[PDB]
Scaffold this motif. Sequence first.
Motif, PDB file in Angstrom:
ATOM      1  N   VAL A  11     -12.761  -6.701  19.870  1.00  0.00           N
ATOM      2  CA  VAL A  11     -13.278  -7.112  19.040  1.00  0.00           C
ATOM      3  C   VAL A  11     -12.376  -7.531  17.525  1.00  0.00           C
ATOM      4  N   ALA A  12     -12.667  -8.060  16.814  1.00  0.00           N
ATOM      5  CA  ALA A  12     -11.710  -7.978  15.399  1.00  0.00           C
ATOM      6  C   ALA A  12     -12.132  -7.233  14.280  1.00  0.00           C
ATOM      7  N   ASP A  19     -14.422  -2.074   1.750  1.00  0.00           N
ATOM      8  CA  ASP A  19     -15.939  -2.961   2.547  1.00  0.00           C
ATOM      9  C   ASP A  19     -15.274  -2.645   4.003  1.00  0.00           C
ATOM     10  N   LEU A  20     -15.578  -3.376   5.158  1.00  0.00           N
ATOM     11  CA  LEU A  20     -15.067  -2.677   6.664  1.00  0.00           C
ATOM     12  C   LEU A  20     -15.769  -3.996   7.031  1.00  0.00           C
ATOM     13  N   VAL A  39     -11.306   5.254   5.496  1.00  0.00           N
ATOM     14  CA  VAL A  39     -10.904   4.654   6.996  1.00  0.00           C
ATOM     15  C   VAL A  39      -9.199   3.560   6.443  1.00  0.00           C
ATOM     16  N   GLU A  40      -8.359   3.052   7.383  1.00  0.00           N
ATOM     17  CA  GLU A  40      -7.452   2.346   8.215  1.00  0.00           C
ATOM     18  C   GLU A  40      -8.115   2.269   9.537  1.00  0.00           C
ATOM     19  N   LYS A  41      -6.075   1.644   9.931  1.00  0.00           N
ATOM     20  CA  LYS A  41      -6.646   0.575  11.026  1.00  0.00           C
ATOM     21  C   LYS A  41      -5.785   1.909  11.978  1.00  0.00           C
ATOM     22  N   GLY A  45      -5.602   2.563  18.694  1.00  0.00           N
ATOM     23  CA  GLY A  45      -6.272   1.813  19.419  1.00  0.00           C
ATOM     24  C   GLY A  45      -7.374   1.870  18.765  1.00  0.00           C
ATOM     25  N   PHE A  46      -8.171   4.056  18.331  1.00  0.00           N
ATOM     26  CA  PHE A  46      -8.768   4.064  17.888  1.00  0.00           C
ATOM     27  C   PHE A  46      -8.910   3.957  16.863  1.00  0.00           C
TER      28      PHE A  46
END
Length: 172
Positions: A11-12, A19-20, A39-41, A45-46
């Motif tokens: 999923v992208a 926002d997200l 939140v971060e990227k 993987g999580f």
Amino acid sequence: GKQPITVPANVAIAMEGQDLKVKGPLGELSITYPREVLVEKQESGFLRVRKAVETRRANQMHGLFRTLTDNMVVGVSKGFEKKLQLVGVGYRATVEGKDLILSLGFSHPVRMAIPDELQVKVEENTKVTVSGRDKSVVGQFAATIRSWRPPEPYKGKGVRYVDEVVRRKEGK
RNA sequence: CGCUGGGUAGCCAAGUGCGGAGCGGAUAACUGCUGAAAGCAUCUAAGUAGUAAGCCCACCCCAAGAUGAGUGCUCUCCUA
Ligand SMILES: [Mg+2]
Ligand SMILES: [Mg+2]
Ligand SMILES: [Mg+2]
Ligand SMILES: [Mg+2]
Ligand SMILES: [Mg+2]
Ligand SMILES: [Mg+2]
């Protein structure tokens, strides 16, 4: 009671800070977070969600978006499916065209529309199954059918979710 | 109206028509969906959906002295 969010779901994911947006094989969703959480990227993987300064509002909200963000991805990867069961002689359910129709003892066949976001099907004359992506619209949709004729105690006649209980009684 | 019998218009009801609509908005009580603090559960201290003769608009009349005195069309301002 937090957990990292599992997102090797092909999923992208994209964000602009406040926002997200998520885009996957069968849908697209969006969400905006207030200024407490962040939140971060995480490249592992999580996804992990931190928070602002320790306070009563944040500890409530820390575990809040954890489950929304979890359902945000599982609903775009697999979706969600709610189940229904119709109990009572003469009670039926059909999908004529787009919307659906029900006959629940009233003197008129109730007719409510199915938005394009959801998906509905029926196997037997006396059961219904919803299929969608977001728990909100899906759960709210199935709750609507339950409201037209909830299950009575004395005989259980009406609509009911799966894997629940019914307070039964004797009428005579 | 001396007393009575009838009576157009007018006025009037006992007579004749009409009226009270809305899958419009926001709520109360209640039922909920999703779901933390509290790995569970919870209708909620994020968010959100149904729903009252009630509340607001819509319906009928008045209304810019609304001194916050509005808006638009048109007209007039001669002679020496
Ligand atoms: Mg007379
Ligand atoms: Mg006379
Ligand atoms: Mg629940
Ligand atoms: Mg939970
Ligand atoms: Mg709230
Ligand atoms: Mg009302």
